[PDB]
Nucleic acid binder design. Structure first.
Ligand SMILES: [Mg+2]
Ligand SMILES: [Mg+2]
Ligand SMILES: [Mg+2]
Ligand SMILES: [Mg+2]
Ligand SMILES: [Mg+2]
Ligand SMILES: [Mg+2]
Ligand SMILES: [Mg+2]
Ligand SMILES: [Mg+2]
Ligand SMILES: [Mg+2]
Ligand SMILES: [Mg+2]
Ligand SMILES: [Mg+2]
Ligand SMILES: [Mg+2]
Ligand SMILES: [Mg+2]
Ligand SMILES: [Mg+2]
Ligand SMILES: [Mg+2]
Ligand SMILES: [Mg+2]
Ligand SMILES: [Mg+2]
Ligand SMILES: [Mg+2]
Ligand SMILES: [Mg+2]
Ligand SMILES: [Mg+2]
Ligand SMILES: [Mg+2]
Ligand SMILES: [Mg+2]
Ligand SMILES: [Mg+2]
Ligand SMILES: [Mg+2]
Ligand SMILES: [Mg+2]
Ligand SMILES: [Mg+2]
Ligand SMILES: [Mg+2]
Ligand SMILES: [Mg+2]
Ligand SMILES: [Mg+2]
Ligand SMILES: [Mg+2]
Ligand SMILES: [Mg+2]
Ligand SMILES: [Mg+2]
Ligand SMILES: [Mg+2]
Ligand SMILES: [Mg+2]
Ligand SMILES: [Mg+2]
Ligand SMILES: [Mg+2]
Ligand SMILES: [Mg+2]
Ligand SMILES: [Mg+2]
Ligand SMILES: [Mg+2]
Ligand SMILES: [Mg+2]
Ligand SMILES: [Mg+2]
Ligand SMILES: [Mg+2]
Ligand SMILES: [Mg+2]
Ligand SMILES: [Mg+2]
Ligand SMILES: [Mg+2]
Ligand SMILES: [Mg+2]
Ligand SMILES: [Mg+2]
Ligand SMILES: [Mg+2]
Ligand SMILES: [Mg+2]
Ligand SMILES: [Mg+2]
Ligand SMILES: [Mg+2]
Ligand SMILES: [Mg+2]
Ligand SMILES: [Mg+2]
Ligand SMILES: [Mg+2]
Ligand SMILES: [Mg+2]
Ligand SMILES: [Mg+2]
Ligand SMILES: [Mg+2]
Ligand SMILES: [Mg+2]
Ligand SMILES: [Mg+2]
Ligand SMILES: [Mg+2]
Ligand SMILES: [Mg+2]
Ligand SMILES: [Mg+2]
Ligand SMILES: [Mg+2]
Ligand SMILES: [Mg+2]
Ligand SMILES: [Mg+2]
Ligand SMILES: [Mg+2]
Ligand SMILES: [Mg+2]
Ligand SMILES: [Mg+2]
Ligand SMILES: [Mg+2]
Ligand SMILES: [Mg+2]
Ligand SMILES: [Mg+2]
Ligand SMILES: [Mg+2]
Ligand SMILES: [Mg+2]
Ligand SMILES: [Mg+2]
Ligand SMILES: [Mg+2]
Ligand SMILES: [Mg+2]
Ligand SMILES: [Mg+2]
Ligand SMILES: [Mg+2]
Ligand SMILES: [Mg+2]
Ligand SMILES: [Mg+2]
Ligand SMILES: [Mg+2]
Ligand SMILES: [Mg+2]
Ligand SMILES: [Mg+2]
Ligand SMILES: [Mg+2]
Ligand SMILES: [Mg+2]
Ligand SMILES: [Mg+2]
Ligand SMILES: [Mg+2]
Ligand SMILES: [Mg+2]
Ligand SMILES: [Mg+2]
Ligand SMILES: [Mg+2]
Ligand SMILES: [Mg+2]
Ligand SMILES: [Mg+2]
Ligand SMILES: [Mg+2]
Ligand SMILES: [Mg+2]
Ligand SMILES: [Mg+2]
Ligand SMILES: [Mg+2]
Ligand SMILES: [Mg+2]
Ligand SMILES: [Mg+2]
Ligand SMILES: [Mg+2]
Ligand SMILES: [Mg+2]
Ligand SMILES: [Mg+2]
Ligand SMILES: [Mg+2]
Ligand SMILES: [Mg+2]
Ligand SMILES: [Mg+2]
Ligand SMILES: [Mg+2]
Ligand SMILES: [Mg+2]
Ligand SMILES: [Mg+2]
Ligand SMILES: [Mg+2]
Ligand SMILES: [Mg+2]
Ligand SMILES: [Mg+2]
Ligand SMILES: [Mg+2]
Ligand SMILES: [Mg+2]
Ligand SMILES: [Mg+2]
Ligand SMILES: [Mg+2]
Ligand SMILES: [Mg+2]
Ligand SMILES: [Mg+2]
Ligand SMILES: [Mg+2]
Ligand SMILES: [Mg+2]
Ligand SMILES: [Mg+2]
Ligand SMILES: [Mg+2]
Ligand SMILES: [Mg+2]
Ligand SMILES: [Mg+2]
Ligand SMILES: [Mg+2]
Ligand SMILES: [Mg+2]
Ligand SMILES: [Mg+2]
Ligand SMILES: [Mg+2]
Ligand SMILES: [Mg+2]
Ligand SMILES: [Mg+2]
Ligand SMILES: [Mg+2]
Ligand SMILES: [Mg+2]
Ligand SMILES: [Mg+2]
Ligand SMILES: [Mg+2]
Ligand SMILES: [Mg+2]
Ligand SMILES: [Mg+2]
Ligand SMILES: [Mg+2]
Ligand SMILES: [Mg+2]
Ligand SMILES: [Mg+2]
Ligand SMILES: [Mg+2]
Ligand SMILES: [Mg+2]
Ligand SMILES: [Mg+2]
Ligand SMILES: [Mg+2]
Ligand SMILES: [Mg+2]
Ligand SMILES: [Mg+2]
Ligand SMILES: [Mg+2]
Ligand SMILES: [Mg+2]
Ligand SMILES: [Mg+2]
Ligand SMILES: [Mg+2]
Ligand SMILES: [Mg+2]
Ligand SMILES: [Mg+2]
Ligand SMILES: [Mg+2]
Ligand SMILES: [Mg+2]
Ligand SMILES: [Mg+2]
Ligand SMILES: [Mg+2]
Ligand SMILES: [Mg+2]
Ligand SMILES: [Mg+2]
Ligand SMILES: [Mg+2]
Ligand SMILES: [Mg+2]
Ligand SMILES: [Mg+2]
Ligand SMILES: [Mg+2]
Ligand SMILES: [Mg+2]
Ligand SMILES: [Mg+2]
Ligand SMILES: [Mg+2]
Ligand SMILES: [Mg+2]
Ligand SMILES: [Mg+2]
Ligand SMILES: [Mg+2]
Ligand SMILES: [Mg+2]
Ligand SMILES: [Mg+2]
Ligand SMILES: [Mg+2]
Ligand SMILES: [Mg+2]
Ligand SMILES: [Mg+2]
Ligand SMILES: [Mg+2]
Ligand SMILES: [Mg+2]
Ligand SMILES: [Mg+2]
Ligand SMILES: [Mg+2]
Ligand SMILES: [Mg+2]
Ligand SMILES: [Mg+2]
Ligand SMILES: [Mg+2]
Ligand SMILES: [Mg+2]
Ligand SMILES: [Mg+2]
Ligand SMILES: [Mg+2]
Ligand SMILES: [Mg+2]
Ligand SMILES: [Mg+2]
Ligand SMILES: [Mg+2]
Ligand SMILES: [Mg+2]
Ligand SMILES: [Mg+2]
Ligand SMILES: [Mg+2]
Ligand SMILES: [Mg+2]
Ligand SMILES: [Mg+2]
Ligand SMILES: [Mg+2]
Ligand SMILES: [Mg+2]
Ligand SMILES: [Mg+2]
Ligand SMILES: [Mg+2]
Ligand SMILES: [Mg+2]
Ligand SMILES: [Mg+2]
Ligand SMILES: [Mg+2]
Ligand SMILES: [Mg+2]
Ligand SMILES: [Mg+2]
Ligand SMILES: [Mg+2]
Ligand SMILES: [Mg+2]
Ligand SMILES: [Mg+2]
Ligand SMILES: [Mg+2]
Ligand SMILES: [Mg+2]
Ligand SMILES: [Mg+2]
Ligand SMILES: [Mg+2]
Ligand SMILES: [Mg+2]
Ligand SMILES: [Mg+2]
Ligand SMILES: [Mg+2]
Ligand SMILES: [Mg+2]
Ligand SMILES: [Mg+2]
Ligand SMILES: [Mg+2]
Ligand SMILES: [Mg+2]
Ligand SMILES: [Mg+2]
Ligand SMILES: [Mg+2]
Ligand SMILES: [Mg+2]
Ligand SMILES: [Mg+2]
Ligand SMILES: [Mg+2]
Ligand SMILES: [Mg+2]
Ligand SMILES: [Mg+2]
Ligand SMILES: [Mg+2]
Ligand SMILES: [Mg+2]
Ligand SMILES: [Mg+2]
Ligand SMILES: [Mg+2]
Ligand SMILES: [Mg+2]
Ligand SMILES: [Mg+2]
Ligand SMILES: [Mg+2]
Ligand SMILES: [Mg+2]
Ligand SMILES: [Mg+2]
Ligand SMILES: [Mg+2]
Ligand SMILES: [Mg+2]
Ligand SMILES: [Zn+2]
Lengths: 59, 204, 118, 131, 122
RNA sequence: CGAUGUCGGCUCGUCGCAUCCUGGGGCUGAAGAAGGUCCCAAGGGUUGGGCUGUUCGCCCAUUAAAGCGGCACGCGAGCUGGGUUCAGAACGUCGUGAGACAGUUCGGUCUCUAUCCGCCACGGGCGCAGGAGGCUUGAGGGGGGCUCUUCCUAGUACGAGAGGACCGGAAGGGACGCACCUCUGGUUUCCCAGCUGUCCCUCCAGGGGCAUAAGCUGGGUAGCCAUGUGCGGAAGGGAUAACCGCUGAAAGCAUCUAAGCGGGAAGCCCGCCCCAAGAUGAGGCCUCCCACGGCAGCCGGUAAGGACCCGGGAAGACCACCCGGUGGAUGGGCCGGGGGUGUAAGCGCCGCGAGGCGUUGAGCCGACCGGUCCCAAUCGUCCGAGGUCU
RNA sequence: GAAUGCCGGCAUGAGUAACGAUAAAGAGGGUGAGAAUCCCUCUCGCCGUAAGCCCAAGGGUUCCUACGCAAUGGUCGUCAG
RNA sequence: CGUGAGGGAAAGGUGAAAAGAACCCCGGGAGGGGAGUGAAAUAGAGCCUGAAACCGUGGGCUUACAAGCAGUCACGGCCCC
């Protein structure tokens, strides 16, 4: 190869447009049926240690 | 222009007049007609066929209304056969007889992101004699200042397969109505379990 | 293409992947419950179930088979005498994976617990 | 649906049950229907089966023999309608399923490596006692 | 699967022992000869005072291949060597005898003399 | 000249036509067959090898043919680096000499990261005046387009004879393309077995690690594959090219033409296959929801639906797509079958022993075809119409 | 306003290449505001004419212990030259 | 920096006075929010003034059928005085 290089500085506009896909999507959360805390679905509740309506974990 | 929906079940060979003949087995029927397309109504002639029974619990309301209008049970797949208008309200493998030639359409196996050698049978490069990290590369893609661009349709690497392919003039070797089975000689696109369409061939 | 191929690679060559599964099995069978990454934990289930199932058969042959992976006679003694009998009427499913809510800090890795079923 | 059973079902019309059981290492005589001019005839191919390739209806086997100074191998579909009959002429005991290695052996070495399978020979003789 | 550079045993008594294919005579660009196909070859080894000698450019028909040949009945056949019989432009054998078995495909391709002279047709 | 890397090859093409072949013609010193010469024609095709850095060319074996040119003598941020064209060395030659020639000879550093356009693939957004779930029309694109042999017609027409047809009809090939994995043939990183050395568990027996990122060896399922299998080029219709006519004046004859009408190419349009309504000219059909509160606009809770999350998938870089989520067979286990391996361990018997025999086609056993709620897809959340104007 | 000017500051490339041998990891326990990365235990792998031990150069407190984690450490750090 | 001869930087400013922010609050700390000092605290020690490039938050106008040395001339729309 022969060391490709940018021909022009990227403008503020074009730089920021490339980033139009970069915003984070918020974590998806549901209430824990036991202790009402918000937590990711399909995970063991970190607040009370319940899953599937029973205690799984010391928390 | 008869046609039917089916699933590709697998391959074997049978023996016919002391010849081994390779076959693809297809489970084709039975297909209920759930809508007819007419010139006055739709501007063309075709029959919408249904196939594989579906759990009603998985069928939403607009689709359900569509089925009900036909007086038809919920089905997994809807597909049209162009220029076909069966007399019955149900299409089966019986529309085909052994010796007939058929066209088969399916979704080809997906190779995902494919190289220039797998996709287009490019020759790649040498594997010795100094060849430097280009063993599977396309080589040149152009000229120089004239035209200073690359042609549309240039053969390059990219996704290959999982696309509609039709194989034509396949011989119907056997049909086994009690099992809704079609035997077609040779190879049919896609994986076992794949959805296919079998149509009367357009070659004479 | 990976068409109909079974088994994870876990970015380990053949003998490391093997040693990984053996080691996790030892740890699972010892403590009855461990925390690992979700993909490792999913893969552990089948490997350990087979060993437990073999312990249920109980014969000399099974013991030597199991020993090939577990190596620890006392552990295998525990497998055969204590663990296997609680599964005598249970046909498969000797292990269970449940996903943990919080990721590992250093590398963001999602974790799971793997445990022997009651 | 059960795709395997459908295939087994299509295959069922062509499956054969009249051919004798044999293993790699056995010596076998295959009476094979053949077309020439202007007629068809039966031609015997006798040799060591060096391979049995199993896929149910689609299993095939390979028989090797020396013909006028030249090694010949034939591959037969185990369920071919062109096989009139198969005769077991000798039971050999191999210690592996594929006998490719005998391609490189003298006749003397082969005779050493595949000695008569006395267990299965006796079995043949115990049967073949007809009522 | 015979191609240019391939050596073949000669299964006749012309005096040639080994020949090297230099062309498969099957159209403008056939890649491979199989049984029943004709080749042009150079004679690479020959016994003294034979009908053909080393250096001669001859024609031959392939009668045996190490690559198995498939038949419509679903069977296949394969030999231990690649062998040819040297012929003239009438597809007639230039020798009086042919050695070893030959493939039955020869018959259908019109090499009757050779097929009948053979000790076995498989 | 604050650099536009120069031969040849390889790879990848694409274009021109002054056409090498295949298709269509006229003339012939065209009997036939085969040619010659010119006209139309660029759709497709245009082999492998020896020599030499070679381009070219000569030669060998074929072929329907082995076309010629353009694209920075196409293509080194694609590869090579044999030629040539830095430094070494030598020969011939020239020069008193240092050195010189392109004359020859051997050798001699070819730069991981692509910003923009372009190109191949794939998404995200918004639009297509209500919001939705499906099924579609095809404007417009792309792909493909080759060709040979034998046989019948008929050893006929033609010809003294050698030789040998048109037209029409069969069959079989080569190369190329798309798909496929039943067969044939590969691979199959741990599916099975055998083996050496060493260390270890536990002394024997039986095993484990390591010898590669498989220690070596013999095998090998699914998958992915070609060497293997199916299928394709068309047919057919339309309009034409050169060319051949019909009728026919101007010009009492003649003239394919000035009016009008036939015939006529592998070429052009369609037909086949694939994409395709961002076709903003945003198309069509079937079905679903509804006239909801407060203030062509705003906030709010909904509907039909959708997304999120999870189990996955011959789908796949992520994304997308497709299936499934306890109303459940989606993956994992387990069970049956297939499949591979090829007769486990233990015990008994024969042998001084290495071993052998029996139990035993045993044991082990990925993916393939199924069964089974044993394990896991718990529980949920958030979006989302109220339909502008003539 | 330009001198491939000088000094300094800050952009672009870009959340991109890379994070320095493919000897390799896994779990449990502890500590702590915080742990893939620190300590302990078990399992696994790698070196073993060394990747172990001793001496001479050279380096110059890097040694030991306690207390620390802003920076240094290619990540992290409760650890550490 | 260089074996060495030798080369050779950058770096000034709270306020009149330290009155240099007790104490409380979140935080492991850093940092901040109150209280408090001061004529002044965007004079708070990373301290006079505090330009420009460059980065961000909020608002007005505007933008997803469009061809561009980015401006200019005209008209119309919307917002503001
Ligand atoms: Mg390069
Ligand atoms: Mg380069
Ligand atoms: Mg580059
Ligand atoms: Mg390089
Ligand atoms: Mg670079
Ligand atoms: Mg540049
Ligand atoms: Mg800007
Ligand atoms: Mg901005
Ligand atoms: Mg950009
Ligand atoms: Mg708590
Ligand atoms: Mg049949
Ligand atoms: Mg389909
Ligand atoms: Mg794929
Ligand atoms: Mg490639
Ligand atoms: Mg390829
Ligand atoms: Mg391809
Ligand atoms: Mg190549
Ligand atoms: Mg090469
Ligand atoms: Mg290659
Ligand atoms: Mg190189
Ligand atoms: Mg290389
Ligand atoms: Mg390239
Ligand atoms: Mg260039
Ligand atoms: Mg241009
Ligand atoms: Mg795709
Ligand atoms: Mg399939
Ligand atoms: Mg791969
Ligand atoms: Mg699966
Ligand atoms: Mg996998
Ligand atoms: Mg594995
Ligand atoms: Mg995975
Ligand atoms: Mg791996
Ligand atoms: Mg990794
Ligand atoms: Mg590996
Ligand atoms: Mg290892
Ligand atoms: Mg290893
Ligand atoms: Mg398993
Ligand atoms: Mg879970
Ligand atoms: Mg999570
Ligand atoms: Mg951490
Ligand atoms: Mg099957
Ligand atoms: Mg059935
Ligand atoms: Mg015979
Ligand atoms: Mg023999
Ligand atoms: Mg018979
Ligand atoms: Mg011979
Ligand atoms: Mg000579
Ligand atoms: Mg210049
Ligand atoms: Mg410059
Ligand atoms: Mg310049
Ligand atoms: Mg330059
Ligand atoms: Mg330049
Ligand atoms: Mg060209
Ligand atoms: Mg012309
Ligand atoms: Mg022509
Ligand atoms: Mg012509
Ligand atoms: Mg003529
Ligand atoms: Mg003549
Ligand atoms: Mg002519
Ligand atoms: Mg002309
Ligand atoms: Mg052309
Ligand atoms: Mg062209
Ligand atoms: Mg051309
Ligand atoms: Mg050539
Ligand atoms: Mg040579
Ligand atoms: Mg050459
Ligand atoms: Mg040359
Ligand atoms: Mg040479
Ligand atoms: Mg020359
Ligand atoms: Mg010459
Ligand atoms: Mg010829
Ligand atoms: Mg000609
Ligand atoms: Mg040129
Ligand atoms: Mg020139
Ligand atoms: Mg020139
Ligand atoms: Mg050039
Ligand atoms: Mg050139
Ligand atoms: Mg070039
Ligand atoms: Mg280069
Ligand atoms: Mg070059
Ligand atoms: Mg270039
Ligand atoms: Mg360049
Ligand atoms: Mg380039
Ligand atoms: Mg360039
Ligand atoms: Mg080169
Ligand atoms: Mg050179
Ligand atoms: Mg040279
Ligand atoms: Mg030269
Ligand atoms: Mg030179
Ligand atoms: Mg040179
Ligand atoms: Mg020069
Ligand atoms: Mg030099
Ligand atoms: Mg010299
Ligand atoms: Mg001299
Ligand atoms: Mg001179
Ligand atoms: Mg001179
Ligand atoms: Mg002189
Ligand atoms: Mg002199
Ligand atoms: Mg000079
Ligand atoms: Mg010189
Ligand atoms: Mg010289
Ligand atoms: Mg050298
Ligand atoms: Mg030189
Ligand atoms: Mg290079
Ligand atoms: Mg560089
Ligand atoms: Mg980069
Ligand atoms: Mg770019
Ligand atoms: Mg540009
Ligand atoms: Mg889109
Ligand atoms: Mg989108
Ligand atoms: Mg169109
Ligand atoms: Mg368009
Ligand atoms: Mg005749
Ligand atoms: Mg006559
Ligand atoms: Mg004809
Ligand atoms: Mg053909
Ligand atoms: Mg298979
Ligand atoms: Mg296979
Ligand atoms: Mg097979
Ligand atoms: Mg095979
Ligand atoms: Mg194993
Ligand atoms: Mg060992
Ligand atoms: Mg010990
Ligand atoms: Mg010992
Ligand atoms: Mg031992
Ligand atoms: Mg070890
Ligand atoms: Mg190793
Ligand atoms: Mg091993
Ligand atoms: Mg093999
Ligand atoms: Mg192997
Ligand atoms: Mg396989
Ligand atoms: Mg092939
Ligand atoms: Mg064909
Ligand atoms: Mg006339
Ligand atoms: Mg006239
Ligand atoms: Mg006219
Ligand atoms: Mg006409
Ligand atoms: Mg006309
Ligand atoms: Mg006419
Ligand atoms: Mg016409
Ligand atoms: Mg054609
Ligand atoms: Mg479509
Ligand atoms: Mg639309
Ligand atoms: Mg559409
Ligand atoms: Mg338009
Ligand atoms: Mg629409
Ligand atoms: Mg329409
Ligand atoms: Mg809903
Ligand atoms: Mg996935
Ligand atoms: Mg869908
Ligand atoms: Mg769903
Ligand atoms: Mg749910
Ligand atoms: Mg539920
Ligand atoms: Mg399931
Ligand atoms: Mg299952
Ligand atoms: Mg199973
Ligand atoms: Mg089985
Ligand atoms: Mg079996
Ligand atoms: Mg035994
Ligand atoms: Mg035993
Ligand atoms: Mg004894
Ligand atoms: Mg005995
Ligand atoms: Mg099984
Ligand atoms: Mg059930
Ligand atoms: Mg359950
Ligand atoms: Mg919930
Ligand atoms: Mg100036
Ligand atoms: Mg500059
Ligand atoms: Mg500069
Ligand atoms: Mg510059
Ligand atoms: Mg400057
Ligand atoms: Mg300046
Ligand atoms: Mg400067
Ligand atoms: Mg600067
Ligand atoms: Mg900027
Ligand atoms: Mg920057
Ligand atoms: Mg990224
Ligand atoms: Mg980039
Ligand atoms: Mg990247
Ligand atoms: Mg990276
Ligand atoms: Mg590296
Ligand atoms: Mg590293
Ligand atoms: Mg690792
Ligand atoms: Mg820990
Ligand atoms: Mg802990
Ligand atoms: Mg840590
Ligand atoms: Mg930490
Ligand atoms: Mg430690
Ligand atoms: Mg070691
Ligand atoms: Mg040692
Ligand atoms: Mg000292
Ligand atoms: Mg120092
Ligand atoms: Mg000390
Ligand atoms: Mg110290
Ligand atoms: Mg220390
Ligand atoms: Mg400490
Ligand atoms: Mg620190
Ligand atoms: Mg730190
Ligand atoms: Mg810190
Ligand atoms: Mg401090
Ligand atoms: Mg640091
Ligand atoms: Mg750090
Ligand atoms: Mg570092
Ligand atoms: Mg601390
Ligand atoms: Mg340190
Ligand atoms: Mg110095
Ligand atoms: Mg110094
Ligand atoms: Mg100096
Ligand atoms: Mg002051
Ligand atoms: Mg002061
Ligand atoms: Mg003052
Ligand atoms: Mg605190
Ligand atoms: Mg606190
Ligand atoms: Mg503070
Ligand atoms: Mg604060
Ligand atoms: Mg404060
Ligand atoms: Mg105050
Ligand atoms: Mg004042
Ligand atoms: Mg003031
Ligand atoms: Mg101020
Ligand atoms: Mg101030
Ligand atoms: Mg002052
Ligand atoms: Mg200031
Ligand atoms: Mg400031
Ligand atoms: Mg703003
Ligand atoms: Mg437009
Ligand atoms: Mg607009
Ligand atoms: Mg303007
Ligand atoms: Mg105006
Ligand atoms: Zn909870």
């Amino acid at each position: 190869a022969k060391h490709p290089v940018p021909k022009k500085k990227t403008s503020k506009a074009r730089r920021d447009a490339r980033r139009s896909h970069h915003a984070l999507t918020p974590p998806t959360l549901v209430p824990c049926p036991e202790c009402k805390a918000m937590k990711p679905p399909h995970t063991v509740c970190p607040e009370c240690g319940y899953y599937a309506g029973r205690k799984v974990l010391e928390v | 222009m008869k046609g039917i929906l089916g699933v590709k079940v697998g391959m074997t060979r049978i023996f016919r007049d002391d010849r081994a003949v390779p076959v693809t087995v297809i489970l084709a029927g039975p297909c209920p007609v759930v809508q007819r397309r007419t010139p006055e109504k739709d501007g063309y002639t075709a029959v919408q066929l249904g196939f594989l029974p579906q759990n009603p619990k998985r069928v939403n309301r607009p689709l359900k209304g569509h089925f009900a209008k036909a007086g038809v049970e919920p089905v997994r797949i809807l597909r049209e056969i162009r220029d076909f208008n069966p007399e019955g309200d149900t299409v089966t493998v019986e529309i085909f007889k052994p010796g007939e030639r058929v066209d088969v359409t399916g979704t080809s196996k997906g190779r995902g992101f494919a190289g220039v050698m797998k996709r287009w049978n490019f020759a790649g490069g040498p594997d010795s004699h100094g060849a430097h990290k280009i063993h599977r590369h396309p080589g040149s893609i152009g000229n120089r200042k004239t035209p200073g661009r690359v042609y549309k349709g240039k053969k390059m690497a990219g996704h290959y397969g999982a696309e509609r392919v039709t194989v034509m003039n396949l011989e119907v070797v056997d049909v086994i109505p009690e099992e809704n089975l079609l035997l077609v000689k040779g190879a049919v696109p896609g994986p076992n379990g794949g959805l296919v369409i079998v149509r009367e061939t357009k070659k004479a | 293409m990976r068409h109909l191929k079974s088994g994870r690679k876990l970015n380990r060559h053949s003998s490391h992947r093997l040693a990984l599964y053996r080691n996790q099995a030892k740890s699972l069978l010892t403590h009855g419950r461990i925390t690992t990454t979700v993909p490792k934990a999913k893969e552990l289930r089948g490997f350990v179930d087979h060993l437990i199932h073999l312990a249920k058969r109980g014969d000399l042959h099974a013991r030597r088979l199991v020993l090939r992976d577990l190596q620890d006679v006392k552990l295998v003694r525990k497998l055969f005498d204590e663990i296997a009998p609680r599964y005598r009427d249970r046909q498969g499913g000797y292990t269970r994976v449940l996903k943990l809510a919080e990721r590992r800090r250093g590398d963001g890795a999602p974790l799971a617990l793997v445990e022997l079923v009651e | 649906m059960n795709r395997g059973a459908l295939i087994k079902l299509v295959e069922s019309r062509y499956v054969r049950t009249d051919l004798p059981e044999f293993r790699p290492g056995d010596t076998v005589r295959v009476s094979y229907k053949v077309k020439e001019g202007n007629r068809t005839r039966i031609q015997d191919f006798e040799g060591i089966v060096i391979r049995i390739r199993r896929n149910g209806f689609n299993t095939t086997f390979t028989v090797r023999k020396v013909s006028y100074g030249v090694g010949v191998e034939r591959i037969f579909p185990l369920h071919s309608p062109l096989i009139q009959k198969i005769d077991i002429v000798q039971r050999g005991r191999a210690r592996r399923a594929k006998l490719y290695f005998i391609r490189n052996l003298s006749d003397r070495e082969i005779r050493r490596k595949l000695r008569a399978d006395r267990k299965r020979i006796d079995q043949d003789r115990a049967a073949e006692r007809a009522a | 699967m015979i191609q240019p550079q391939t050596y073949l045993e000669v299964a006749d008594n012309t005096g040639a022992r080994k020949i090297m294919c230099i062309r498969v005579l099957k159209g403008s660009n056939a890649k491979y000869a199989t049984v029943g196909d004709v080749i042009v070859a150079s004679v690479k080894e020959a016994i003294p005072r034979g009908a053909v000698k080393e250096g001669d450019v001859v024609k031959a028909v392939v009668v045996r291949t190490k690559k198995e040949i498939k038949r419509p009945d679903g069977s296949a056949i394969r030999f231990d060597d690649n062998a040819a019989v040297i012929i003239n432009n009438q597809l007639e054998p230039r020798g009086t005898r042919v050695f070893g078995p030959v493939a039955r495909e020869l018959r259908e391709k019109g090499f009757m003399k050779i097929v009948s002279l053979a000790p076995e047709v498989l």
